[PDB]
């Protein structure tokens, strides 16, 4: 528990959506294995009912935690002013918002907020897609190469054992892809950085990008509790970790790389900071009370990775091979000590892979996972993890791209 006299005043939760069906199932994805991909019970890209339940289990945890620390009421529904949800436009994030409220405040008549037009990107989450700002294609190449520490064309050489493992789990040698190109998974698909003319769309092509997607899909199959996960081929924790290493690397390159991170993460970073009490300007969330205690932002793994890259936070998650798992969230807390001095603390809160698979109840006695995070740039951050707000404010204002602020 926190230091003597310390009081939790305000929380900002940046959460990934819950377990979802694969966003897409391409021809390449089908061709790299002779096995058939399992059918999901929802449309591609939608949160599953189980994904919603899992999220509500996390909302239950947050309720108990925020009651303990004095921020929410014991028993009683919270006032509507106390809790606010802003979700991205997608079905998966809106339903994540809704499921959070059902767990945080069961049978309370609360509702989420989101952009009015859901058929257009919300610039808070995707400023680049929404046309707020754009990147330079050449600077993207250099930044990504800098982040990998090596030419991207050689990336697969950093991940030979992981790729080989993905190859056996797929039975890639006996796949259609290989009867159409006659076979090694790494050699067949060298890494490359591809960017469109606009510099508005960037992707890692080749084996590490493809395997990142596949590995996440296997993790989601497990979290969904599907009868067969990767066709029975993942047996050990070591194999999970080795598969998901591809996915975390892909995210580091495509979303943590600071040049990319700041173009995509600036609006959220500014919004978070402002909710925490920074004197920095930010586009207001509609209908939010000055008296708001809990701001829950329902977004994506790319958002968390963006914020991570901007603030330089890294972590690994005990029992959870995905660094940005379904329902995992960055939880920013505003604390004041007894002299009234405000600090920021940041945790990565998540469900372990076993908590997802077992749909485990999350309570103070049987909690969600949680990792206390260092902010390297905050040189006056205390050993117990508090970052003075005045320092946190400066840090943010130096990390943002001014061209990507929401005007």
Author numbering: 3 to 184, 189 to 413
Please, what does the article write about this entry?
Phytases (myo-inositol hexakisphosphate phosphohydrolases) catalyse the hydrolysis of phytate into inorganic phosphate (Pi) and lower phosphorylated myo-inositols. Here we report the identification of two HAPPs from the enterobacteria Hafnia alvei (HaPhy) and Yersinia kristensenii (YkPhy), together with biochemical studies of their pH and temperature optima, as well as their phytate degradation pattern, which show that they are 6-phytases. The enzymes share a common catalytic site architecture located at the interface of the two domains involving the conserved N-terminal active site motif RHGXRXP and the C-terminal HD. The two-step reaction involves a nucleophilic attack on the phosphorous by the histidine from the RHGXRXP motif to form a covalent phosphohistidine intermediate while the aspartic acid of the HD motif serves as a proton donor to the oxygen atom of the scissile phosphomonoester bond.
The apoHaPhy structure at pH 7.5 was refined at a resolution of 1.90 Å with one monomer in the asymmetric unit. The first two residues of the N-terminus, five residues (184–188) in a small disordered loop and three residues (414–416) at the C-terminus were disordered. Six side chains on the surface were modelled as dual conformers, while Glu181, Gln182 and His183 have poorly defined side chains and lie at the start of the disordered loop. The model includes seven glycerol, five acetate and 306 water molecules. The overall fold conforms to that of known HAPs with an α domain (residues 25–45 and 137–264) and a α/β domain (the remaining residues) with two α helices on each side of a twisted β-sheet. HaPhy possesses four disulphide bridges involving cysteines 79/110, 135/410, 180/189, and 384/393, the latter being highly conserved in all known HAP structures. Yet another difference from the EcPhy active site structure is that there is no change in the conformation of Glu222 (Glu219 in EcPhy) between the apo and ligand-bound states.
